[PDB]
Design a protein around this ligand. Structure first.
Ligand SMILES: *[C@@H]1O[C@H](CO)[C@@H](O[C@@H]2O[C@H](CO)[C@@H](O)[C@H](O)[C@H]2NC(C)=O)[C@H](O)[C@H]1NC(C)=O
Ligand SMILES: *[C@@H]1O[C@H](CO)[C@@H](O[C@@H]2O[C@H](CO)[C@@H](O)[C@H](O)[C@H]2NC(C)=O)[C@H](O)[C@H]1NC(C)=O
Ligand SMILES: *[C@@H]1O[C@H](CO)[C@@H](O)[C@H](O)[C@H]1NC(C)=O
Ligand SMILES: *[C@@H]1O[C@H](CO)[C@@H](O)[C@H](O)[C@H]1NC(C)=O
Ligand SMILES: *[C@@H]1O[C@H](CO)[C@@H](O)[C@H](O)[C@H]1NC(C)=O
Ligand SMILES: *[C@@H]1O[C@H](CO)[C@@H](O)[C@H](O)[C@H]1NC(C)=O
Lengths: 388, 388
């Protein structure tokens, strides 16, 4: 989508995976979906170093609105959970130099049972969001037919533009259509959306992450070519800092999402996040690679019988990123190979930096053998710069 | 096995899951299988509070011996990796008030390819171990037929007794025979072994833990009745502190192994263990319940459609232990029920202590509703004492 936005994958926080549709603010004041949740996450992003790293979006997902539109047919937030309205929430977020994202559903109802954005409501809702000061909109696709979606998604892109307010547009259209051609036309998506959820919702477990990793890389031929500045593939939220991932697994999701040029939308409680989880999510070099200006999504290039997978992502400044991933469940594994074997130019030399450890290799020749030790369900990630 | 040993499930450290058959001491001085590994783990157990809690066994697993017996036909440790011999290692461990465990295989070769204990070598090997000062022996079953195992396992029990040295005897016999009757006779196992590996080796992943949990509880009817002081079911090593389990998952394995009256044999690097992992493994109340004098293995009593499972273990002093386990992957879950609904006596009251948080409920009436909040892949564990 050529609206000057999302020239790099969106970075921020999104409520859904961690907080879901919790409306029990009486017993879960901090974990329930309310204006307070977003204001506090905004303070967290603004105060704990996240903002400086690039994390700027504070996104509201499903279950924020009243169970019905007002009499005028407009969407309104839940009165008890959002007593100051959305515009006020936006100002608050804006005052911190952050941006506010909201959620809607092209259809009769949101997946959670809240007011849906039917075709006759698209222009009005887009208008309502802009007036509130919204900066990003995720448009879900429950309760709408393929025909209605084919009309509605492009229609909402036009409506958003008409408001004159630049709004990042996240589309779930592909996921509802199976995520693959011919049913999905990624060329069209690139023209109308800034990013799109291609596949299943991420759940809080390592198997969920693996399921997403495997679907995207198995189908990379029909997905990788359509990602770029202004239009990204979205494998869903980062679940680092939550309940299901071990330390190694958390490092793995961050690394693989970076290879995929995926949005870095955290869905975790920033008020209780652990130091190790924070350290992973705040890795500057990792973020630099994810945010690379060229926006060329990487690919899996090797699947060893040793249960080791290798990924490569081409970058700006003639650089590259490599991820060595172990799916073994026995012990740290010694993977030995050479850049030449991985496909790099002959007779060259590279300065290599281990993204997580910081260790550097001054001048690795492409013909030289090297060994990396990868832990179970973990990765070793390299940033490579050619010497001249 | 009535040898006065293992009146409570064995507690200690075992090398296998974490260190496997690593013999590359040149590049992995600390992680390779050598006398140094065991001496250092012994120091760890003796110095970091483990010994006082009950952890006393330091067990050597596969890959410790020389590739062949000496000329006299006796087992000898690998010369380079165990330069001071086993007896010296035992003395060292003994000097710390700990006990040394060793590994052998009833068959032509150990699963790792090392010298096996064939039938004609049983008496000699049992003799060799006693002389070295061995306190525990795990007898694996690779490369032996069912007929040979039927003869060898009972035969080794007799050989060990004859040495006059009390030795905990861990038998893998059942695992090689499928772990279920009629092929396996757990009454016989109780007579000849102190504990036995019934099922597959644990690997470093949550799915491995779940696979073990599900097999044992699905088949609890033919397993639970045969566990007791002196003879236990062994679901394998604790992998808390390693690469594949998240925090919640680690707490879950500890709790479920305690419900199963399982040995608490840690297989992790005690030199680098995290504070949180240490805190889980050192939980005194948890250990007290695992070590309960009655030795009555618990059972799964409920499998909700909410993906919540409930476990109960009867204890001494008319007490009980309950585990509420969530296999959901969405968010913290509120499980509401009553002790009456769980099956407890009518019109009674209990003092309840949350094993992990320490929070206490003074006098919970069996008829009163209560709610516990369980995190994804996590547990809530209670210790209950009746009031009078
Ligand atoms: C509506 O669409 C127009 C283009 O159709 C957007 O204008 C483009 O903005 C980008 C970045 O600001 C420029 O690089 C292009 O040159 C512009 N194109 C044209 C035709 O001028 C405009 O930003 C959109 N409006 C909103 C609010 O999204
Ligand atoms: C060999 O077996 C005998 C029993 O057959 C063991 O002796 C028993 O030891 C326990 C605990 O010390 C006592 O409760 C029993 O009363 C003993 N039984 C008998 C018949 O005396 C003996 O400990 C075993 N020897 C070894 C080295 O394991
Ligand atoms: C996909 O959409 C683009 C953009 O509208 C269009 O040019 C192209 O023809 C479509 N492809 C197919 C197979 O319909
Ligand atoms: C490099 O390592 C590979 C093992 O992956 C080996 O086959 C090859 O012979 C090595 N090359 C040299 C020059 O040692
Ligand atoms: C199981 O072993 C015990 C102990 O030797 C024996 O008494 C019993 O008969 C055996 N059960 C069967 C079915 O063979
Ligand atoms: C106790 O909670 C259950 C829900 O599990 C509910 O059905 C029941 O009515 C409650 N009992 C009382 C007295 O509130």
């Amino acid at each position: 989508l050529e609206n000057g936005l999302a020239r790099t994958p969106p970075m921020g926080w999104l409520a859904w995976e961690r907080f879901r549709c919790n409306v029990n603010c009486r017993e879960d004041p901090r974990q329930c979906i309310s204006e307070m949740l977003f204001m506090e996450m905004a303070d967290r992003i603004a105060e704990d170093g996240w903002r400086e790293l690039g994390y700027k979006y504070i996104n509201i997902d499903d279950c924020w609105a009243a169970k019905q539109r007002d009499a005028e047919g407009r969407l309104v937030p839940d009165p008890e959970r959002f007593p100051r309205g959305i515009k006020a929430l936006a100002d608050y977020v804006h005052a911190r130099g952050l941006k506010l994202g909201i959620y809607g559903d092209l259809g009769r109802l949101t997946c959670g049972g809240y007011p849906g954005t039917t075709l006759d409501r698209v222009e009005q809702d887009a208008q309502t969001f802009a007036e509130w000061g919204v900066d990003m909109l995720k448009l879900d696709g429950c309760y709408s037919s393929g025909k209605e979606q084919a009309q509605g998604y492009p229609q909402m892109a036009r409506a958003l533009n008409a408001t004159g307010r630049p709004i990042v547009y996240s589309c779930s259209w592909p996921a509802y259509q199976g995520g693959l051609p011919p049913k999905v036309n990624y060329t069209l998506l690139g023209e109308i959306c800034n990013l799109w959820r291609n596949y299943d919702d991420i759940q809080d477990s390592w198997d969920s992450v693996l399921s997403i990793v495997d679907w995207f890389f198995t189908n990379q031929d029909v997905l990788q070519p359509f990602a770029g500045p202004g239009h990204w593939n979205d494998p869903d939220m980062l679940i680092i800092g939550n309940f299901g991932l071990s330390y190694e697994q958390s490092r793995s999701q961050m690394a693989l999402w970076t290879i995929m040029a995926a949005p870095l939308l955290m869905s975790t409680d920033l008020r209780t996040i652990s130091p190790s989880a924070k350290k992973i999510l705040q890795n500057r070099l990792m973020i630099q690679i994810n945010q690379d200006p060229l926006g060329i999504q990487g690919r899996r290039i090797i699947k060893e019988g040793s249960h080791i997978e290798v990924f490569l992502r081409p970058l700006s400044q003639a650089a590259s990123a490599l991820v060595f991933f172990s799916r073994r469940t026995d012990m740290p594994f010694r993977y030995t190979t050479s850049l030449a074997k991985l496909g790099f130019p002959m007779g060259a030399a590279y300065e290599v930096q281990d993204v997580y450890s910081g260790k550097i290799i001054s001048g690795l020749k492409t013909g030289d053998n090297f060994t990396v030790i990868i832990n179970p369900s973990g990765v070793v990630m390299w940033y490579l710069c050619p010497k001249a």
